[PDB]
Amino acid sequence: TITAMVYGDDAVKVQDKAASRFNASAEAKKANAKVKMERIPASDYPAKLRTAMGSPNAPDIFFNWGGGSIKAYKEAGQLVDLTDVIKSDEVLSTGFLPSVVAAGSLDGHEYGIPMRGMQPVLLFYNKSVFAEHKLTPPTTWDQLLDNVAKLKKAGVTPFALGGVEIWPELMWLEYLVDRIGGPQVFDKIRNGDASGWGDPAVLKAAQTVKQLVDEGAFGKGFSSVSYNNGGAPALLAKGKAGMHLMGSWEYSTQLGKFPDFAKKDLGWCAFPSFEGGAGDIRNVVGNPCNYWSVNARTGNKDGAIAFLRDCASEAYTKDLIDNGDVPTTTIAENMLDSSPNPEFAKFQYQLVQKAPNFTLSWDQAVDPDWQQPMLTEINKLFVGKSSPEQFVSALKGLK
Structure with a gap:
């Protein structure tokens, strides 16, 4: 036995x-x-x-x-x-x-x-919002920014975001570090070297996230929106947001909560490339x-x-x-x-x-005793409580 x-x-x-x-x-x-x-x-x-x-x-x-x-x-x-x-x-x-x-x-x-x-984490989108505003799924970071600018102008939050759980915020940083510095950056970090957080791709990802939050890409009250209670998927399903970066279980979440939207108007694409990034653009996280x-x-x-x-x-x-x-x-x-x-x-x-x-996903990959402290610092960065530099300093102090 x-x-x-x-x-x-x-x-x-x-x-x-x-x-x-x-x-x-x-x-x-x-x-x-x-x-x-x-x-x-x-x-x-x-x-x-x-x-x-x-x-x-x-x-x-x-x-x-x-x-x-x-x-x-x-x-x-x-x-x-x-x-x-x-x-x-x-x-x-x-x-x-x-x-x-x-x-x-x-x-x-x-x-x-x-x-x-x-x-895998994918970039899901609402094809009906995209249709009405002449947008296509972004393949590059500039196209993603283009879609952010046009959605804002159109009165629609560019991305749904379950800030409550923090790990939905974490997904943006995961793809950005990989897109910018390649997989070697997180590999070094997850195998227990906290000075790895000092890699320039981490700060750059953190600055990129700050720019998106600062520019209104997630709207204003995302820190009180939950993924797990259906708040974030609902935003997408209702066309209140145009995109949603999420693990592939988003399809089953939408199917069980908003089945007509799931079957008709839910799209998905890969996380876009990033200009001058080291990462192979086919790399996945999740x-x-x-x-x-x-x-x-x-x-x-x-x-x-x-x-x-x-x-x-x-x-x-x-x-x-x-x-x-x-x-x-x-x-x-x-x-x-x-x-x-x-x-x-x-x-x-x-x-x-x-x-x-x-x-x-970094929350499963890091030492268990880094998991909560990391998510705390991620949250602080998203809500403006930390600058990108302070975020990096905090994580470098992990033991």
């Missing part, structure tokens, strides 16, 4: 179907293994994983977000380094988009196998997937890796697709016609397939 600790939201049914398939397979019986999927409530998951890992009967494999979500376990010597396991394996070595597996790495080493869908990692102390490593190989399989891929997710498997590439929204799924999968890099 291989114990698997998993995040028990509705999507767990995919991991249960996987455990069922795996436990009945020749490969499991060969390894003398059976997987026991142990669901933990979504809100309790980080603490309950902490408790489990710090005692005997820690899980053999466990659900995580990669990066800082697993720092303390990596530091505590509690994880199987998968870098070479993946490279040696006929299934694992070619089974996933490489950028997604790299996204949650620690120090160039991979400790996760992708087990859920990718959720949720690369969630991951399984493997406890170093597991009695059945071979059974555990056999179960991980099922994450790359056609049957696993089909279950994720039927769930409305966009798998990160290579086998998915020609299977997307059975998605409930194949156009949006194929848009995402092709976008990520061509990306040189997928950067894990």
Whole structure:
């Protein structure tokens, strides 16, 4: 018995179907293994994983977000380094988009196998607002600024923004740092060097954000608008805002709250290029997937890796697709016609397939004890409480 600790939201049914398939397979019986999927409530998951890992009967494999979500376990010597396991394996070595597996790495080493869908952040827009004001989706930063100027003139907030949660503000900085300095800038930062915040691309991103807020790109009361209660999606859906930078779950949010708008007038595009930036303009940021990692102390490593190989399989891929997710498997590439929204799924999968890099959202990627202090400083910058320089100074002081 291989114990698997998993995040028990509705999507767990995919991991249960996987455990069922795996436990009945020749490969499991060969390894003398059976997987026991142990669901933990979504809100309790980080603490309950902490408790489990710090005692005997820690899980053999466990659900995580990669990066800082697993720092303390990596530091505590509690994880199987998968870098070479993946490279040696006929299934694992070619089974996933490489950028997604790299996204949650620690120090160039991979400790996760992708087990859920990718959720890149995209620039969504209201095609009806765009139609009425002769705007097109911006491909460059100047075009984005052009659309900001014309929306303002037209009485429409250029971007919806869930300031309440702060992480919706964070998405602008994530794309800007990547567009300006390339992925190396955040990579250096997420691997625990706070002087990395002193990179010029960070200050530039911060100045760019200040310019947009100062220019009215998010309107005036965004700090009291919530994403999670539907305030920000509603602004877009109602044509009160013209664009919305958001994780790809914005499509499902709109579909469940404003279905006619979702099916007819919701558009999406990549975050635009930025003039003179180092970043490859196809690079993506967001949720690369969630991951399984493997406890170093597991009695059945071979059974555990056999179960991980099922994450790359056609049957696993089909279950994720039927769930409305966009798998990160290579086998998915020609299977997307059975998605409930194949156009949006194929848009995402092709976008990520061509990306040189997928950067894990900074709030999951940084050391956990940086997460709140970072979001606080992000909020201060957006609300004018910090200058770009003060924002950089604060983050450089992180330990």
